[PDB]
Design a protein around this ligand. Structure first.
Ligand SMILES: NC(=O)c1ccc[n+]([C@@H]2O[C@H](COP(=O)([O-])OP(=O)(O)OC[C@H]3O[C@@H](n4cnc5c(N)ncnc54)[C@H](O)[C@@H]3O)[C@@H](O)[C@H]2O)c1
Ligand SMILES: NC(=O)c1ccc[n+]([C@@H]2O[C@H](COP(=O)([O-])OP(=O)(O)OC[C@H]3O[C@@H](n4cnc5c(N)ncnc54)[C@H](O)[C@@H]3O)[C@@H](O)[C@H]2O)c1
Lengths: 206, 215
């Protein structure tokens, strides 16, 4: 059973991703994390921890002390949210990745990081997430795993969270590449690991 | 007449470019800079300064105190050494770059950064060099101008004299004549947009390459 740390956990996806993995590997094996304050219920779901991504030593303390093997990395400044504060966006996305790759490469941690489908600091850092992530796989052993999320509710949320769960369960031997395109409504994604979008146009209305 | 700051100048290109521009714009108009001790002659060639690219504050000072209008960013860890020192290479190529962009965009500087023709953190940062600089051209008015250097012959290739001249030319150009910020630049093999837009013509094809090299 793996030990999870979800970075940027209080976002749209992170909370759901958490409660999926919790009912899988157990309550105490998924550690949720953010810089913002957790609502009443999401706190009590399971171990929540303040974790600043720009603070490199925070991550290490946590990954050592809490014996982390799997790390999901959702913390990022959104496109428009970061276009007003570029320095911040650039730091949080690119420096944050750098700190995340180092912690994971050093302490032998499976690293999930989502990408997307550049005129925008968010987009530039997603290209950079892919290329850097692929480099740390070659240069060190880093078990880096990434899949380009499209639009999420294009695709439904329950497909998006389960796509993330499956690609981490799978063996590294059956992954021809480290960055995957995941599409609902992507052959390699469907071939290497059994990917199938459940929610398509009609049953998405239900 | 612009005032030039070269960055990482004590490399291969840096001294050549420095010596080229000092003949063009004047000696004390071109400040050369690096974090190494410059040889006796290059130090006296004209204004030399310690410029660490990992100190943002240091750059601002330099840029303001000398009214730097043009900046040539040559400070880098080329993959060879950077592949061992990933941490140090990452910082210098990426965070270093960031600092250059910011200083440039702030004090309204014309910024030259060279790229190359990705499984090495050097290469990954050169992709980054390009996608940022162009973003910074749209997000702010940053006059960012990038050539993609090929194999650079000295003593898909190119003799050093072309490399340097091409860089002077792409910076002298009217912003009006540039359809794009990153331009391919080619000589020989053994760059349509560059020739099309700002009149790039390489004077050192092969015959004269061999001619010069033998001296
Ligand atoms: N929302 C979508 O539909 C969508 C679409 C495409 C891609 N994605 C990708 O999915 C990922 C997660 O999506 P989401 O909706 O959960 O994110 P979100 O935008 O809802 O939340 C982002 C989180 O990042 C955190 N954060 C910001 N700076 C931080 C720092 N320095 N340290 C730690 N945390 C910090 C915030 O507190 C926040 O909880 C994103 O990285 C994004 O690239 C999402
Ligand atoms: N000549 C080529 O083969 C070639 C090919 C393609 C691209 N390029 C590009 O041209 C540029 C210059 O090439 P070069 O031949 O001078 O390389 P070089 O290795 O000779 O010079 C790099 C310089 O960067 C300096 N430097 C290192 N860390 C620094 C820091 N923190 N602050 C300031 N300076 C620092 C070093 O002192 C060194 O003098 C590079 O950016 C490279 O991307 C060169």
């Amino acid at each position: 059973p793996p030990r999870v740390l979800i970075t940027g956990g209080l976002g749209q996806l992170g909370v759901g991703l958490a409660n999926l993995l919790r009912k899988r590997f157990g309550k105490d094996n998924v550690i949720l994390s953010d810089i913002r304050k957790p609502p009443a219920h999401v706190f009590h779901s399971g171990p929540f921890v303040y974790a600043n991504i720009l603070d490199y030593k925070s991550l290490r303390e946590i990954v050592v002390n809490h014996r982390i093997s799997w790390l999901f990395h959702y913390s990022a400044l959104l496109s428009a949210v970061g276009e007003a504060n570029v320095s911040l966006a650039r730091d949080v996305n690119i420096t944050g990745l750098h700190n995340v790759l180092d912690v994971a490469a050093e302490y032998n941690v499976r690293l999930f990081v989502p990408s997307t489908i550049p005129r925008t600091i968010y987009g530039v850092s997603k290209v950079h997430t892919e290329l850097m992530g692929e480099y740390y796989y070659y240069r060190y052993g880093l078990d880096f795993r990434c899949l380009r999320y499209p639009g999420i509710i294009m695709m439904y949320i329950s497909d998006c969270l389960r796509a993330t769960l499956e690609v981490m369960e799978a063996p590294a031997e059956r992954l021809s590449m480290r960055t995957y395109n995941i599409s609902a409504m992507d052959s390699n994604a469907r071939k290497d690991w059994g990917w199938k979008h459940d929610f398509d146009l009609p049953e998405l209305v239900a």
